[PDB]
Amino acid sequence: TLAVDEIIETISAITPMAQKAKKYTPPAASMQRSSNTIWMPVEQESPTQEGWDLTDKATGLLELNVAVNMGEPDNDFFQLRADDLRDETAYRRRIQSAARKLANNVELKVANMAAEMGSLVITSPDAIGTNTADAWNFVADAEEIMFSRELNRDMGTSYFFNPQDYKKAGYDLTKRDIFGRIPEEAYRDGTIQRQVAGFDDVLRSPKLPVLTKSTATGITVSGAQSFKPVAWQLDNDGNKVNVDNRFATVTLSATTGMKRGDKISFAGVKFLGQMAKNVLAQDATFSVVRVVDGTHVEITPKPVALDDVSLSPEQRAYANVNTSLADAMAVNILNVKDARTNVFWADDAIRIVSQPIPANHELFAGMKTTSFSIPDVGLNGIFATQGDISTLSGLCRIALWYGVNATRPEAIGVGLPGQTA
Amino acid sequence: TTSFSIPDVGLNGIFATQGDISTLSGLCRIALWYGVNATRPEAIGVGLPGQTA
Amino acid sequence: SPTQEGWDLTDKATGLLELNVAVNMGEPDNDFFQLRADDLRDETAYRRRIQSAA
Amino acid sequence: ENRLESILSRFDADWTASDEARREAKNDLFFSRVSQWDDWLSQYTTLQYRGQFDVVRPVVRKLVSEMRQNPIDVLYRPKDGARPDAADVLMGMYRTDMRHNTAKIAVNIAVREQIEAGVGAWRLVTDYEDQSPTSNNQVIRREPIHSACSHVIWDSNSKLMDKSDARHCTVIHSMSQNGWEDFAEKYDLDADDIPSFQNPNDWVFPWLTQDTIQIAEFYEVVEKKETAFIYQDPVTGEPVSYFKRDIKDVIDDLADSGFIKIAERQIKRRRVYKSIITCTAVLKDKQLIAGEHIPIVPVFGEWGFVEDKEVYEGVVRLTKDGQRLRNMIMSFNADIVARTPKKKPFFWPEQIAGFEHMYDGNDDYPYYLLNRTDENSGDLPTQPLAYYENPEVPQANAYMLEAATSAVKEVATLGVETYVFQDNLATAMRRDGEIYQSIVNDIYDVPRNVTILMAEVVDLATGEKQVLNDIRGRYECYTDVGPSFQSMKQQNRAEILELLGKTPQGTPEYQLLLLQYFTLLDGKGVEMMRDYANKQLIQMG
Amino acid sequence: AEILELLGKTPQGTPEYQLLLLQYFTLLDGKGVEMMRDYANKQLIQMG
């Protein structure tokens, strides 16, 4: 009846995205009084005129910013009955499993946030394993769209495949009827390569989401809308409240079938060169982050238009779209079929804000608290234990507080193979 | 519970703290237990001015 | 292990569940043979039978 | 960022870390000094016998007497390759300013608390004296710390027994109104603003007035590289003097006196800073004090770490369960003796009706008479007389009393002897010697011996203040432990006697005996013998 | 300690005198022990 002491090891998880994403811990008192949010400035872009006399043409200065906040603690509250053999045993294997589960949850939230707030969308009409070097073409498309927009890839880039498409890429490499070094490695091991098509890190992630198709159809922009970059705006009291730059709310005819995470593209708008403002040949892709009302959505890249007439030059310096929405633009939906997502990003686009839970404080007497270290990820939470003689059951809790933020959604991406029909 | 010295008046009280893990909350209680007695009210007095009808 | 989110978690604790698997043995694997005393004056077949049994 | 916030964060961390050990030590002190019947103000308490029958106190007294009979003091000895008398001046200064009653009393207090609770401590402080200064119109004295377990909070991240790796330490002072007035007077503080801090005591006894005013002294050690100035001594050689020790006072007085700077190096050393703190504000910020070490010397009994938690124990902690059981059982037996009916006969009232005056207790009668008949029952029923049973102590109570006393006697055996406790005291005295050497180098006038006489090279500033000039070749002696002495003459007498007791009767025996007569104290007869001994040694060359 | 250990096994002869003078030579310094050590040093030097 009683069991031996050898654990049948059954699962083994890996957390590559959470390991790779940077971690940020802002000061605790400042966050407490600041409501667990903190603003960071965005790199300044300057306008430029041409001419000799510039009377009354002096511009001003503008410096936009973004905000990073935190959500709710992820706990493993559990109970310990006094008179139980099953509870006396395994109450340490439970702690180990809690650590692994908490790290897994962190990685899952990172992957979901990246997939549902990635603006750059690469799509394909067929599966990866159909034509030759199609997986390389996918990774290269990601790299080329990041290069054309002149994004900041200074601190690294990364491409995450799902296991099925990783196997498709490996199959494409081995079926070559040749064996050099890349085919030999992709045949012996399953690994395609570590650097592919320009990215300096190409991994396979086991828990990328599935981006279910969007049933939205026949939606049009309702009224001309112009979005203007600001750093702050005045509220009802005259107080200047900061304005976030990575969101913009837009009114459409009817937002039916839309949800958080669908990828859209208005018909007519195009990407710019960001730094040089040279019009690209690639349609601007946006991602909806919230469906508010029945006629509003929130899209993460704010479409500052270059041809806008109401924009001051210091605002037009931040343009990222060639033209503005014009009351009839048909909005196309890019995810027209279910498919597990591949996710690419610049390595400094996702961060993990972290805060302590000061339960070691003297106010929390009676309960015993330790620092708890979740593995793989560099996160620390608390491990607390208490017990009420009323029910004669010790209560054990493990808490750890974090918030995943996408500071640059214009750098995060989503690869969508086989988006036909 | 620990001691907690009330200055100004030469008194001591109890500073007691408790914690709740089901909410991650805490309680603090500062309690002074005293009592004022007038042992010689025939010695205590009171002065009242402007006591006209 | 499971997990839950939030600050207030009153009456939301969980118990512990540890599972088991069973490992056992089965029928012994044998090799019998019977020989008379006169049949062990050579012993070569006896030794080779032992080897082949192994 | 606030200095107060950083100080209070450190103090809160250390106070929370050292909670269990402090509580047990306070309980052991109360158990072995006030009363073994704890829990004052238990709401559910009626009046019952609670007697204190003690067996741990004779053991504690025996151990304290044993430790007192074998004193231990510091003994500075010359290093390897140093001059053979490199420690005479420092030893003389230590014996000079550690011969007072205060140093002895501080060590005794620390030792007694080490025996009972598990930790004691004492302090070293520097004061200004004009009548009998040790050197440089200053003295170094040792002061007691009572209840060090609750009054000295050490830096948590210290894994050493003497706490030489502790980066900070806070000492809590509790004072009455007049004590606070004197404290504020001596530290030039505002006596009108009453201070407050964590109370390190507990209303555990019916003491009718308790203390109310608390301050803290926060010591921190900062190890950094600071600038040193290499000079050339006008007599000979090149000394090294710290820039901070003559930063403004004599930087040009050295040049006037004739010191030429040769170079300038950066040498790494430690400085000790003190702050006077209440729970609301910092009263003194970073007053720099003399020395490289925190001036508090701790003494431990049984010391260790269990799981990142420091635990110490004395001789009383283990005996408490047995002693409490024995007190409770003896109280129960005393109640048995007091409130229990005595052995008396059982009578029916009709059996003795009319003869009620024969059993009251007088001895006027030769027998006892009982009634025989009843009118309605013919005759009184016959039954053997019964007597109330005598009070008896239960076998359970007797067995438990014997077994609890036996357990206390078996567990209250420190050591086999106090060898380990004396060794921990010796460790503390070695740390004390280190701290004293550092403070001496900081403030006292240390002469340098030349082989070409002691040459004290010093100078005065324009404000008439004298700034000592101690070279960096200062750590010429290390610390050992030896018998306690009051003066260098006494130490020399002890050394000569020790040599004499081992030298056989020859020519060195004569030499040592004449030397002893030379070093002897003075009267008239000993004066005659000492004059004779000096003459004999001189005339023998 | 080494000189004392040797002294404890050498009988009372010329090596015993040499070891006693050596032990005096290796002593700490006060005033009287200074005199004794100087005497031992001079005796050892003179004895070649």
Q: Which of D141, D138, D135 is nearest to D89 (CA)?
A: D135
CA atoms within 13 Å, Cβ hemisphere of A298? 12
Q: Cα separation of A211 and A6, whole Å?
A: 41
Query: Choosing among A80, A362, A388, A395, which should be mutated to test the B contact, i.e. which has the most B CBs within 10 A?
Result: A362
| Contact (CB, 8 A) for D231 and D250 | no
Q: Which of D286, D296, D1 is nearest to D122 (CA)?
A: D296
Query: Choosing among C11, C16, C19, C20, which should be mutated to test the A contact, i.e. which has the most A CBs within 10 A?
Result: C16
Put simply, the answer to whether D496 touches E20 (Cβ < 8 Å) is: no
Among the partner residues A73, A91, A395, nearest to C5 by beta-carbon distance: A73
φ/ψ region of A138 (left if φ > 0, alpha if ψ in -120 to 50, else beta) reads alpha
Put simply, the answer to whether A385 touches B24 (Cβ < 8 Å) is: no
φ and ψ of A370, to 5 deg: -130, 155
| Contact (CB, 8 A) for D221 and D165 | no
Strand, helix or coil for residue A41: strand
Q: Which residues have C-beta within 8 Å of that of residue D353, sequence separation ≥ 6?
A: D371
Among the partner residues C9, C16, C21, nearest to A75 by beta-carbon distance: C9
Q: Would the CA dihedral through D371, D377, D378, D382 be positive or negative? A: negative
Looking at residue A271, the DSSP 8-state letter turns out to be B
Among the partner residues C3, C16, C21, nearest to A101 by beta-carbon distance: C3
Chains with 3 or more CB pairs under 8 A to chain D: A, B, E
What are the tokens at C19? 């599972």
Looking at residue A206, the DSSP 8-state letter turns out to be T
What are the tokens at A45? 């872009």
Residue the block writes with tokens 């005013």: D213
Question: Which CATH number is A293's domain given?
Answer: 2.40.30.240
Beta strands A240-242 and A232-234, pairing class? antiparallel
The answer, yes or no, to whether D and B have at least 3 beta-carbon pairs within 8 Å is: yes
| Contact (CB, 8 A) for A284 and A274 | no
What are the tokens at A321? 């779209």
Strand, helix or coil for residue A363: coil
Cα dihedral angle (A107, A109, A115, A118), rounded to 10 degrees? -100
Enumerate chain C positions whose Cβ falls within 8 A of a Cβ in B: 7-13
Q: Concatenated DSSP letters for D219-287?
A: EEEEEEEEEEEEEE-SSSS--EEETGGGSSSSTTHHHHHT-EEEEEEEEEEEEEEEEEE-SS-EEEEEE
Q: Cα separation of D479 and D489, whole Å?
A: 20
Strand, helix or coil for residue B46: coil
Looking at residue D56, the DSSP 8-state letter turns out to be H
Q: Concatenated DSSP letters for D413-442?
A: ------HHHHHHHHHHHHHHHHHHHHHHHH
Neighbours of B11 (CB within 10 A): 14
Residue the block writes with tokens 């004052």: D40
φ/ψ region of A43 (left if φ > 0, alpha if ψ in -120 to 50, else beta) reads beta
Q: Cα separation of D93 and D135, whole Å?
A: 8
Q: Cα separation of D368 and D358, whole Å?
A: 6
Chain E residues close to D503, C-beta within 8 Å: 20
Q: Cα separation of D541 and E43, whole Å?
A: 12
Q: Which residues have C-beta within 8 Å of that of residue A135, sequence separation ≥ 6?
A: A128, A165, A168, A169, A172, A192
Q: In what helix (H) or strand (E) does residue D7 lie, and over which residues does it extend?
A: helix D3-17
Neighbours of C19 (CB within 10 A): 8
Q: Which of B8, E6, E37, C54 is nearest to D212 (CA)?
A: B8
Q: Cα separation of A108 and A351, whole Å?
A: 14
Chain C residues close to B22, C-beta within 8 Å: 8-13
Among the partner residues B17, B21, B28, nearest to A384 by beta-carbon distance: B21
Q: Which residues have C-beta within 8 Å of that of residue D28, sequence separation ≥ 6?
A: D116, D117, D118, D314, D316, D317, D320
Chain E residues close to D518, C-beta within 8 Å: 32
Neighbours of A346 (CB within 10 A): 21
CA distances, A38 to each of A69, A73, A356, A381, D294 (Å): 7, 18, 16, 21, 41
Type of residue numbered A263: K
What are the tokens at D378? 């013919």
Tell me if chain B has a CB within 8 Å of the CB of D466: no
Put simply, the answer to whether E30 touches D515 (Cβ < 8 Å) is: no
Cα dihedral angle (D1, D5, D7, D9), rounded to 10 degrees? -110
CA distances, D246 to each of D234, D461, D466, D472 (Å): 18, 10, 10, 14
Q: Would the CA dihedral through D463, D465, D471, D472 be positive or negative? A: negative
Residue the block writes with tokens 């080779």: C48
Residue the block writes with tokens 């209560």: A395
Residue of B nearest to C10 (CA): B22
φ/ψ region of A33 (left if φ > 0, alpha if ψ in -120 to 50, else beta) reads alpha
Least Cα separation, residue E46 to chain D (angstroms): 15
| Contact (CB, 8 A) for A289 and A300 | yes
| Contact (CB, 8 A) for A78 and A394 | no
Looking at residue A263, the DSSP 8-state letter turns out to be E
Q: Cα separation of A42 and C1, whole Å?
A: 41
Q: Cα separation of A274 and A317, whole Å?
A: 9
Put simply, the answer to whether D492 touches E36 (Cβ < 8 Å) is: no
> Which residue intervals of D45-163 are DSSP H helices?
56-68, 88-97, 101-116, 148-151
φ and ψ of D22, to 5 deg: -65, -40
> Which residue intervals of A35-181 are DSSP H helices?
85-88, 93-117, 134-148, 163-174
| Contact (CB, 8 A) for D433 and D426 | no
What are the tokens at D121? 């401590």
What are the tokens at D68? 């007192």
What are the tokens at D247? 């930063």
Q: Cα separation of A272 and B21, whole Å?
A: 53
CA distances, D133 to each of A374, A419, D97, D138, D143 (Å): 61, 95, 9, 5, 17
Q: Cα separation of A47 and A275, whole Å?
A: 10
Strand, helix or coil for residue A222: coil
Resolution (angstroms) stands at 3.1
CA distances, D15 to each of B24, C31, D19, D169, D170 (Å): 22, 75, 6, 11, 10
CA atoms within 13 Å, Cβ hemisphere of D189? 23
Q: Cα separation of C22 and A286, whole Å?
A: 55
Neighbours of A141 (CB within 10 A): 19
Q: In what helix (H) or strand (E) does residue D490 lie, and over which residues does it extend?
A: helix D488-502
A376, with CB counted inside 10 A (0-12, 13-18, 19+), is middle
Q: Cα separation of A409 and A301, whole Å?
A: 7
Looking at residue A283, the DSSP 8-state letter turns out to be B
Among the partner residues D85, D86, D515, nearest to E32 by beta-carbon distance: D515
For chain B, counts of helices (H) and of strands (E)? 0, 3
What are the tokens at D4? 């107060």
CA distances, D355 to each of A172, A343, D370 (Å): 126, 115, 7
Q: Cα separation of A95 and A105, whole Å?
A: 15
Q: In what helix (H) or strand (E) does residue D513 lie, and over which residues does it extend?
A: helix D507-519
D3, with CB counted inside 10 A (0-12, 13-18, 19+), is middle
What are the tokens at D330? 């003896």
Chains with 3 or more CB pairs under 8 A to chain C: A, B
Q: Would the CA dihedral through D28, D29, D34, D39 be positive or negative? A: negative
Chain B residues close to C10, C-beta within 8 Å: 22-23
Measured at the CA of A279, the angle between CA A278 and CA A285, to 5 degrees, comes to: 125
Q: Cα separation of D499 and E25, whole Å?
A: 13
Q: Concatenated DSSP letters for D516-539?
A: HHHHS--SSHHHHHHHHHHHHHHH
Enumerate chain A positions whose Cβ falls within 8 A of a Cβ in D: 360, 362
What are the tokens at C24? 């056992």
Method: cryo-EM
Q: Which H, E and C letters describe D32-44, residue by residue?
A: HHCCCCCCCCCCC
Q: Cα separation of D69 and A97, whole Å?
A: 60
Instruction: Measure CA of the first residue to CA of the last residue in chain C; give whole Å.
Output: 47
Looking at residue D308, the DSSP 8-state letter turns out to be S
Type of residue numbered D19: D
Looking at residue C39, the DSSP 8-state letter turns out to be G
Least Cα separation, residue A98 to chain D (angstroms): 23
Q: Which residues have C-beta within 8 Å of that of residue A59, sequence separation ≥ 6?
A: A47, A312, A313, A314
Put simply, the answer to whether A8 touches C14 (Cβ < 8 Å) is: no
Owning domain of residue A299: 211-339+408-416
Least Cα separation, residue A82 to chain C (angstroms): 12
Q: Would the CA dihedral through D292, D298, D304, D309 be positive or negative? A: negative
Q: In what helix (H) or strand (E) does residue D482 lie, and over which residues does it extend?
A: strand D477-482
Residue of D nearest to B13 (CA): D203
Q: Cα separation of D461 and D443, whole Å?
A: 16
Over its C-alpha atoms, chain A yields an Rg (Å, rounded) of: 25
Put simply, the answer to whether B21 touches A397 (Cβ < 8 Å) is: yes
Q: Which residues have C-beta within 8 Å of that of residue D274, sequence separation ≥ 6?
A: D217, D218, D219, D284, D286, D287, D288, D289
CA distances, A347 to each of A109, A146, A158, A375, A406 (Å): 16, 13, 7, 21, 11
Least Cα separation, residue C12 to chain B (angstroms): 8
Q: Cα separation of A388 and A386, whole Å?
A: 7
What are the tokens at D23? 């509580």
Chains with 3 or more CB pairs under 8 A to chain B: A, C, D
Put simply, the answer to whether D492 touches E32 (Cβ < 8 Å) is: yes
Chain D residues close to E22, C-beta within 8 Å: none
Q: Cα separation of D79 and D478, whole Å?
A: 6
Beta strands A263-266 and A286-290, pairing class? antiparallel
Q: Which residues have C-beta within 8 Å of that of residue A245, sequence separation ≥ 6?
A: A42, A64, A65, A66, A229, A302
Q: Cα separation of D90 and D74, whole Å?
A: 11
| Contact (CB, 8 A) for D169 and D175 | no
Chain E residues close to D512, C-beta within 8 Å: 36
A374, with CB counted inside 10 A (0-12, 13-18, 19+), is buried
Q: Which of A203, A141, A132 is nearest to A172 (CA)?
A: A132
Least Cα separation, residue D170 to chain A (angstroms): 18
Q: In what helix (H) or strand (E) does residue D219 lie, and over which residues does it extend?
A: strand D213-232
| A vs D: CB pairs below 8 A | 3
Beta strands A401-406 and A350-355, pairing class? antiparallel
Neighbours of A375 (CB within 10 A): 14
Chain B residues close to A385, C-beta within 8 Å: 21
CA D298 centroid distance within chain? 8
| A vs B: CB pairs below 8 A | 35
| Contact (CB, 8 A) for D253 and D466 | no
Q: Cα separation of D461 and D464, whole Å?
A: 5
Q: Cα separation of D273 and D405, whole Å?
A: 51
Chain D residues close to E28, C-beta within 8 Å: 77-78, 84, 87, 495
Helix D507-519 to helix E32-46 angle (10° resolution) is: 160
Neighbours of A265 (CB within 10 A): 20
Tell me if chain A has a CB within 8 Å of the CB of D20: no
